[PDB]
Amino acid sequence: VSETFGYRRLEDFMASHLDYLVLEWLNLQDTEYNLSSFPFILLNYTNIEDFYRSCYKVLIPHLVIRSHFDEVKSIANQIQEDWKSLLTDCFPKILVNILPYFAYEGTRDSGMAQQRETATKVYDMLKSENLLGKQIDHLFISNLPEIVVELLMTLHEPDLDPAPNPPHFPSHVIKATFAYISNCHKTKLKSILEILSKSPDSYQKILLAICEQAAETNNVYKKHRILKIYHLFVSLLLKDIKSGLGGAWA
């Protein structure tokens, strides 16, 4: 199947859907259905530790949003790596799980309000001293293009095309999340592109990050979705041509 689709290796095709597989596996919420029981043999990884090493960047955010911090701690001390570093490396993927639910009409319905509630609970919980709460703001400010790219990649506008990985939001929700991020800033500016303009090289990174994932894939639908994300970002950039993008406009 992977050879027919065009992936040079089975690992690439299988990891293209790994986030959806992990979320669907955890959605069963049964005692026998656990991350350890996940069939890593479908991947070429021989043992569970290799699977953890190769996919922690995907598995950790799901455990964090589902509040199984004991599970990620267990993964950390079996993988023989810094638990602090493991939690830090996956920060943008977790942020695109908590942040977007604040800025879109909370408590509008009983359905989507619980996502807001659990996101707020989790975010307030990592603010404690034991977790990243001491330098959470510094980690937020330090690599802002990462959150921007990961938030952009969740774009999905409802035609007759496959849906992306499970966390996906419409464009207006992404813009609301950007507005909330800018508002939550200490100086409280109206536009995210202002703080993005503090480091002019950031525009270089984001445009590359959208470009890179555009070139790695060969599926037409995924390429079209990435092109739509690119169009959204470029339109947002052009909307702030009045003041210039910190000397990086050319």
Add this chain to the structure above:
Amino acid sequence: VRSAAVTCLKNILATKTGHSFWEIYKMTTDPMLAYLQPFRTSRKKFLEVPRFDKENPFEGLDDINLWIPLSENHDIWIKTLTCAFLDSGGTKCEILQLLKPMCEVKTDFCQTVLPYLIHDILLQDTNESWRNL
């Protein structure tokens, strides 16, 4: 290639030689200055390019097979020769040290940069060991 070029541009502009180049070159009108504005940054301390002292700086280059493999593969030959010149400690110019990632991805860049590496090697040559080799 784009990512390697961006990394090399940042590294070169960060060093003292890049700053000194910018002081002279900013007077002239050129689109390249406009393109390179975002990558440049102002820092209190200049970028430091590490110097490693090889026990024998000549063992990497004193290989006849390295100079003439000639197995109908020009690209890997030129890449290996440029890399062998770069990984030796003979090179003294700092901006030449930062050209390895872009050399690894482009053969034309290796061909362009090899004469400069040889010239820099011979410029710092003492007792004519490098010249003889």
